[PDB]
């Protein structure tokens, strides 16, 4: 990825995008439609990925 955008609200995230090694997590933002690199070890990301994997 790169660096990690700091303090991005969860409600501002449309969806997450995991890249194939070019963890690489990218968040699509709702207010400005940008793609931002998210920090993988944030608590709310780990819980988001669980809901998707049905766990």
């Amino acid at each position: 990825c790169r660096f990690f955008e700091s303090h991005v609200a969860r409600a501002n995230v449309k969806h997450l995008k995991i890249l194939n090694t070019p963890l690489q997590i990218v968040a699509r933002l709702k207010n400005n439609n940008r793609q931002v690199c998210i920090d993988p070890k944030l608590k709310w990301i780990q819980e988001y990925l669980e809901k998707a994997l049905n766990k």
Partner: antibody
Amino acid sequence: EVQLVESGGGLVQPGGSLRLSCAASGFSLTVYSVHWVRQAPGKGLEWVGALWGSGGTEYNSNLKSRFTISRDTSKNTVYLQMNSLRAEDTAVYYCARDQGLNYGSLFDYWGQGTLVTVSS
Amino acid sequence: DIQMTQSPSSLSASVGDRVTITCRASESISYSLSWYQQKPGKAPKLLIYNAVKLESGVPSRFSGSGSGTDFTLTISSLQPEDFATYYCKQYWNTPFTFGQGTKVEIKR
């Protein structure tokens, strides 16, 4: 030079309907998101819903979808359709531009506000 | 639904007094909290975003701190034009929710 102007405020009967406007200049709705906020007279602030530049819509779930947010990019104007109003819907209705920072939704530019009164 | 709560509801201090306003969230909101100033008959004016960031044009006598469920807005030196109701807004989750406001009066 960003300027938001509301209009369409006025008296409505209970169970009645109304539409508001928000003409934006100095910036494009294609780049910036716009939000509706209402404030009952002498009360607190209430986030109605959001209209993204992408652009879809986000609503406050407590409103029972009795409101509809819409956009006409060719006019660069945002609307709010109000349906089956109650007395509790009497409030000043602001529109505010989303600053568009990655942090989240932040209202940097506001309109003067328009007042909807629901009474028989 | 995250409900925001502020303390106190009202306060009266003198020109030049430090004043703080507490903002509590019913649930953790990280650093996604903002502060708004609203004068009578006017629209709210954004002061602090991201808990501690002061936006352009706002006098640095305003200051913010906090995280999680506890936040606080500090006016380090009260001015006569600080008369207003101060709201905190949470943008961590939808619906975005406001505090009920804090009324600041000037003693003279």
